[PDB]
Amino acid sequence: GKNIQVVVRCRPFNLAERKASAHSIVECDPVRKEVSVRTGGLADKSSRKTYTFDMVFGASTKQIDVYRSVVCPILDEVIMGYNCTIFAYGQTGTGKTFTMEGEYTWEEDPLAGIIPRTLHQIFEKLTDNGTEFSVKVSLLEIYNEELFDLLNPSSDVSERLQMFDDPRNKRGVIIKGLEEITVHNKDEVYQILEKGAAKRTTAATLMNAFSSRSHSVFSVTIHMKETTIDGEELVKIGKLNLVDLAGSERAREAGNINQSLLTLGRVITALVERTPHVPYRESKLTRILQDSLGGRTRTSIIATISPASLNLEETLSTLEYAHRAKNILNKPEV
Ligand SMILES: Nc1ncnc2c1ncn2[C@@H]1O[C@H](COP(=O)(O)OP(=O)(O)O)[C@@H](O)[C@H]1O
Ligand SMILES: [Mg+2]
């Protein structure tokens, strides 16, 4: 494809779908990279709609496999000194958070998601090659188009963060007062995710800013300096934005979400097709990530879906959205 990769990840059935007597309507073919949905209504057992993506992950797909296939290529980009972004898009309950952060010593938990493994690899790789480096991370939430710092020890209330341009080459934004925690070792990441989780819970309870209706943006910035005898030194800065989007399924409270997700989709489609003018300025989410989506870089979207007939509507909606972002045509022979 391109620098923009769109993959789909289907989760296994959950308890509620079993108790509701739901049926599997999704078929994943990792070889042909297709996802086909049994769409028939009453008496219609023949009509199915197929879609093609850069990759397709079945329900048995393991955390490490999503990481190996989707993130490794991207992290190598970041290490070379680039800004990249990874998205988790889909219906609430389909695995966006299970995928972005997931759920010992140096060996990674098999349920660990993209975030634990990523920090993990930063330290292993930069330590192994003797690079001089420092790693800082920030975690903010976007709810009803307002920013909240999830790692600020103090200034913890329902106070939003001020966003604004900045005298410098455009595309960037400065988020006034964004807490940026320095990480000293790979394991220190779980403690960071704990603080975030605890503060998100507070915002949920004290604002109704439920995680399922918000965008979580966890950014890791790596400052690197590498040297070799008869090879000159290098100063690089890499940044990876790991985004856990709001569920794709109050009046405008659902408008801001529905709108930003549609704006995001338009920004992605504009980048794939190279149409002048990409609508970054139309949403807080795309404005904040412009600097990473703007310049040349690797960008990936992980579309999560349910396999049950109970969620057919949202699954088709998600597949259509993923298809619209990067139109890949189905190949011959079914
Ligand atoms: N692919 C998966 N494999 C195993 N469990 C998953 C998978 N995807 C989601 N889950 C499970 O579903 C729930 C997590 O869903 P979650 O990540 O919160 O979805 P979302 O973030 O989109 O709301 C947990 O029970 C989690 O273990
Ligand atoms: Mg979630």
Curated annotation (Swiss-Prot):
GO terms for biological process: cell division; microtubule-based movement; mitotic cell cycle; mitotic centrosome separation; mitotic spindle assembly; mitotic spindle organization; regulation of mitotic centrosome separation; spindle elongation. Its main location: cytoplasm. GO terms for molecular function: ATP binding; microtubule binding; microtubule motor activity; plus-end-directed microtubule motor activity; protein kinase binding. ATP binds at residues 90-97. Residues 3-328 form the Kinesin motor domain. A subset of this protein primarily localized at the spindle pole is phosphorylated by NEK6 during mitosis; phosphorylation is required for mitotic function. The modification N6-acetyllysine is found at residue 125. Keywords: Acetylation, ATP-binding, Cell cycle, Cell division, Coiled coil, Cytoplasm, Cytoskeleton, Disease variant, Isopeptide bond, Microtubule, Mitosis, Motor protein, Nucleotide-binding, Phosphoprotein, Ubl conjugation. GO terms for cellular component: ciliary basal body; cytosol; intracellular membrane-bounded organelle; kinesin complex; membrane; microtubule; mitotic spindle; nucleus. It is found in: Cytoplasm; Cytoplasm, Cytoskeleton, Spindle pole. Interacts with the thyroid hormone receptor in the presence of thyroid hormone. Component of a large chromatin remodeling complex, at least composed of MYSM1, PCAF, RBM10 and KIF11/TRIP5. Interacts (via C-terminus) with the kinase NEK6 in both interphase and mitosis. Interacts with RARRES1 and AGBL2. Interacts with TPX2. Belongs to the TRAFAC class myosin-kinesin ATPase superfamily. Kinesin family. BimC subfamily. It is linked to Microcephaly with or without chorioretinopathy, lymphedema, or impaired intellectual development: An autosomal dominant disorder that involves an overlapping but variable spectrum of central nervous system and ocular developmental anomalies. Microcephaly ranges from mild to severe and is often associated with mild to moderate developmental delay and a characteristic facial phenotype with upslanting palpebral fissures, broad nose with rounded tip, long philtrum with thin upper lip, prominent chin, and prominent ears. Motor protein required for establishing a bipolar spindle and thus contributing to chromosome congression during mitosis. Required in non-mitotic cells for transport of secretory proteins from the Golgi complex to the cell surface. This is Kinesin-like protein KIF11. The lineage of its organism: Eukaryota, Metazoa, Chordata, Craniata, Vertebrata.
